[PDB]
Amino acid sequence: LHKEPATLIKAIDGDTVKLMYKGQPMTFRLLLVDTPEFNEKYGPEASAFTKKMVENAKKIEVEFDKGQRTDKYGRGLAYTYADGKMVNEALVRQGLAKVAYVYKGNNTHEQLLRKAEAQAKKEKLNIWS
Ligand SMILES: Cc1cn([C@H]2C[C@H](OP(=O)(O)O)[C@@H](COP(=O)(O)O)O2)c(=O)[nH]c1=O
Ligand SMILES: [Ca+2]
């Protein structure tokens, strides 16, 4: 997999963000995770967390997996990085997302995120409290 540049346009919620990719505005849906909706428990904390992460980054990168790069809503499907730190993994490690939506071919970082979920659950963090 390879990291590609992108620039923040706008935080959206815990697992979507608006980024400019190859000069085009795009909504990105974070691979392999599921945050609560803003209106659900830990929803606002997940949105806040992703928002701070992406707004504070001096460098945003997106990394597509081997399978589909857009979903049925035309959202990009990527692993997204804030100054070298994966947002997808960070959310899971903090217990603000579950590993989810694991589809064959777009699952390179599955066991990295499952490892993070196991540690968040061990710590009873947030969703696992
Ligand atoms: C993460 C991800 C979501 N999706 C689609 C599946 C779900 O379909 P449905 O909308 O029919 O439930 C939806 C969940 O995204 P949200 O969690 O953003 O709602 O997005 C993909 O198709 N591929 C993916 O990799
Ligand atoms: Ca969600």
What would your notes on this structure say?
The protein is an alpha+beta fold and 129 residues long. The protein has a single domain, classed as Beta Barrel (OB fold (Dihydrolipoamide Acetyltransferase, E2P)), CATH 2.40.50. The protein is built from three helices and eight strands. It has helices spanning 43-56, 87-93, 110-122; strands at residues 3-11, 16-21, 24-30, 33-34, 60-64, 76-82, 85-86, 98-99. The strands form two sheets. It has a five-stranded mixed barrel with strand order 1-2-3-6-5. Strands 4-8 form a two-stranded antiparallel sheet. Strand 2 (16-21) and strand 3 form a beta hairpin. It binds thymidine-3',5'-diphosphate and calcium ion. Residues 29, 31, 34, 71-72, 77, 101, 103, 106 line the site of thymidine-3',5'-diphosphate (THP). Ca(2+) binds at residues 15, 34-35. This is Nuclease A.
